[PDB]
Amino acid sequence: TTALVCDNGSGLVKAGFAGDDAPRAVFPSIVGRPRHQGVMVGMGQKDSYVGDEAQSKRGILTLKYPIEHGIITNWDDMEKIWHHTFYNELRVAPEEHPTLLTEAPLNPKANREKMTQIMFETFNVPAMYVAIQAVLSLYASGRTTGIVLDSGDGVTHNVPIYEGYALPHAIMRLDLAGRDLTDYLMKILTERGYSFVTTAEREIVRDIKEKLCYVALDFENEMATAASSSSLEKSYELPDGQVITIGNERFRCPETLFQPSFIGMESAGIHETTYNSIMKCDIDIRKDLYANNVMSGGTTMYPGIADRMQKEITALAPSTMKIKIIAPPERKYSVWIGGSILASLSTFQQMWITKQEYDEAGPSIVH
Amino acid sequence: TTALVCDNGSGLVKAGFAGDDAPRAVFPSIVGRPRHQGVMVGMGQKDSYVGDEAQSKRGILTLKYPIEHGIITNWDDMEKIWHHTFYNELRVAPEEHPTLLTEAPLNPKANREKMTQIMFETFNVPAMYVAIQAVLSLYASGRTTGIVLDSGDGVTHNVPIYEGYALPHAIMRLDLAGRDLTDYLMKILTERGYSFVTTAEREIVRDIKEKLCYVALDFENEMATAASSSSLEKSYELPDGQVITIGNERFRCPETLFQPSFIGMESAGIHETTYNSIMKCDIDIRKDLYANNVMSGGTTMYPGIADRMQKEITALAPSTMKIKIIAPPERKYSVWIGGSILASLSTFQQMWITKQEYDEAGPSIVH
Amino acid sequence: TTALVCDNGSGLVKAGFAGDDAPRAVFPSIVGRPRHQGVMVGMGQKDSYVGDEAQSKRGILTLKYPIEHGIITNWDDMEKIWHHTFYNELRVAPEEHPTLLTEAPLNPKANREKMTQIMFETFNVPAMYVAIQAVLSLYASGRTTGIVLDSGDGVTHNVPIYEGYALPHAIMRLDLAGRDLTDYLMKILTERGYSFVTTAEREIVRDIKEKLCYVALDFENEMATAASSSSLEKSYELPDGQVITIGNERFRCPETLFQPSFIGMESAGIHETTYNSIMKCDIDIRKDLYANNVMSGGTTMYPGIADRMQKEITALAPSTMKIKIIAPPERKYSVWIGGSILASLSTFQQMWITKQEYDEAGPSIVH
């Protein structure tokens, strides 16, 4: 009876036992299906492939991310990767111990109900509970106060927290980064004549975004530092072995986070939406928030993301006030680290909802 | 009730029981007819001669290959050699056990319908099935993934296969090699004043192509190695006993496979049509294909065919990617070996189409 | 000094003066070369043949389309047909008046730079400008708002436009139809035993696609209306005079536009990619787009293309919303009609880029 904690994070899905610095299974969430006729009468093949099992054989497969923007669109597949994650990958019987379940702040409640559902009547679990993406970033980072920033592939949001008292009216969820950053990248790369568009190749694109993006850090002279002289163009061999040439859009793709007029969806931009989240907070409360903003999203490894937020957030706010963006490298597992902390420790053991409670009222109880 | 598996391969036709490393009957497909007046009132003679029965007595006979380019032009004769192959040669009653039937990838379906037909209403067979030339080369070679190359006398084609999921849109059939290689050879040999043109002598020509051709392997200095100094000219006694002198065209005849501007039919050439087949495949899928291309056609014994493909395919593709052309000597029976494997093993026993199915819908069901 | 407007459209290339309902030169874009030895010592022959000059004598020639998918792969030939189009065909000095130049929405900018280049230093032109395939379809159709659909031989794309404010993030370019539709047709016709594969004969195939294709319009019962009873099979005499039999694939070839699992390249299909373009547009903006979608591609004359889009687009979208697909017959010249409108009218006269501007900064200015 030890806690295992899993996440919905689209992208990679991450699950492991309580009391550990990293989950035992980290694999992308995909339900793949063959788009071609079976020749191998060898029925050793499968209906569909999930995770790395699918991620290994790609161009053959078609790829469906079940987690759209934090909301989960397709349930039938989604239960499979859970059905997998409990059995293969990390190998556990479905009934041992409860599970803390990561989940999105502002998403529709109908998300978490069917999800609490299929954690019971299909395969019964010794209770359950569902926390929020951000609230576990502090249990991980150990802070009590402070605003967060979370992105990941599922959705980008920030949840200012002070002494474990949330400020829900200030929670700002703008859906961006994540997948939507590649879909701009597949869009932009055609500048150099690379036509990448198919469901299976998309990840080949992503592994560019992984390797070289960073953040422009005042990309005015940066484009001119790209345009005029070329020192920053790097080449990336791709699974066939052919060279790719880049560097005008290397920084330019993540730059869209600060000007979503590149991607075309017009809302805010991520740097000041934290500010425009702070301003909605109280006058008193905000002094330390500027110092404590953690920015652990799981997207942002960009070498110089934090460095530009420093520049941009100081351009906002009164300059007399010290702002500190902590960028711990152990993030991208952070939201999971909180699980292996929160559920591991106690005073939470009565915060689970047992199958009783689901028999008590119903799925509506989690709210 | 044991499976016997036969092929359409024009050229030699090959048939034998399941579970064997080589068919029991390998004989060329010809329906011969006498072109002269019968003197022997001895009616012990026949209407027509088939296979080696014909191949023994040639200049007397006229030779008609019923299998044109994989497509079978003449049915009336074609059923005879089948009518033979079941009775004489390998001696079996027409009704014992089903038969797997080899057949061409891109050929018109009207090919395989009349062929499935005459496997029923004329002589009834306990079910049936028709596979593809290439798909059985992997069951033989044991590979699962990998692109093929098949030529034979019937037609040349390549069918990239990955985990027994075919890539039909990438199947490249260019009709070449086979018979059409001799018809260039009978064309080229007149260089030395050998006028070979008659239907019966054509095979005398072929037995040169059998013995000495190889492949030029960068035949730029090769022609100059032919022209300038003569070390490579070899002589071949022919059924009368007269010497033949060759060697400028020894390599030059199969060389046409890489430049079908010698034969005059302009399409591609065989080396890069595999490449131009690969490129049509997916970006991901293609890494291993370059390593796995089997080139088992039944034509290609040419000592140094594989050696030049190595040279030519590396001249294509990104050089950072390892390409491996496997050239197993057991080929030329390969496409049959697959039959004695596939049909021998099980999960295929329900993949036959019983005479029921032909009574169910009709010949259209095989598709 | 009157405007002449030309297009890149692969396929046919179309050019003519401003202020006209149709270009003065409509001829296919090919640079042909003889694949055989010259016998006529008569040097009256040429290095290469372009356009109809080539299109007249085909089997002799080899055919290279310089415009691949909107992108132009071969420049050296491409300048010839321009070099022709200015001199022969429409007969004009290279220096009279600027030229509006049609061009693809999402193609790499390196396309249009070398193209703006060779409009200056090789032959100098009184300024220049390059518009987009779609944006001129409204100036032709006279609409201001509305989404388009464009295909042609070069590439298929749709560019929703509202009050002359483009929605670039919603521009959906999937490369399909055009040439790639024949290459499936040459692939499919072998069903009936017609082996058409050579570079010169390809157009013989195309002239079938011209004559009889239409669109299946719910081709479920249609195939059964083909299979079961044969009323729709039509015959086409080909340049030798021999009959062709068709009709199972008559509708089936353009049908691939709605299911590119026939051609094998898996992306979307053209009917809903407009929908999946609309959905990416704003909630407000989309009411009228459904009414205004023009579908002028230059491919689509298919008798019943618009009729099935009606069926399919209504199957998508809320049914409470009126959708109207206008299919003006004057299209296929439409993208050119816009030129003879846009450039003819004024407020555009300062939108040209004079040779000054190219001397100002360089080719990078067009962006």
Ligand SMILES: Nc1ncnc2c1ncn2[C@@H]1O[C@H](COP(=O)(O)OP(=O)(O)O)[C@@H](O)[C@H]1O
């Ligand atoms: N080094 C990196 N550079 C840029 N982007 C990255 C990097 N590492 C991960 N990402 C992006 O961040 C995502 C993290 O996904 P994940 O953390 O599972 O989402 P969530 O936070 O919703 O769980 C990856 O899928 C990838 O798209």
Ligand SMILES: Nc1ncnc2c1ncn2[C@@H]1O[C@H](COP(=O)(O)OP(=O)(O)O)[C@@H](O)[C@H]1O
């Ligand atoms: N050693 C060799 N060298 C050159 N050509 C050969 C050699 N052996 C066979 N061939 C050619 O390859 C053909 C193989 O025919 P076959 O395998 O029956 O065609 P298919 O593959 O369609 O069944 C022979 O008919 C002959 O023309």
Ligand SMILES: Nc1ncnc2c1ncn2[C@@H]1O[C@H](COP(=O)(O)OP(=O)(O)O)[C@@H](O)[C@H]1O
């Ligand atoms: N009546 C028709 N039926 C089917 N296809 C057609 C018909 N007319 C033209 N096409 C196809 O549409 C193409 C139009 O080419 P074009 O308009 O020059 O391309 P672009 O739009 O890029 O300029 C032709 O080359 C032909 O392939």
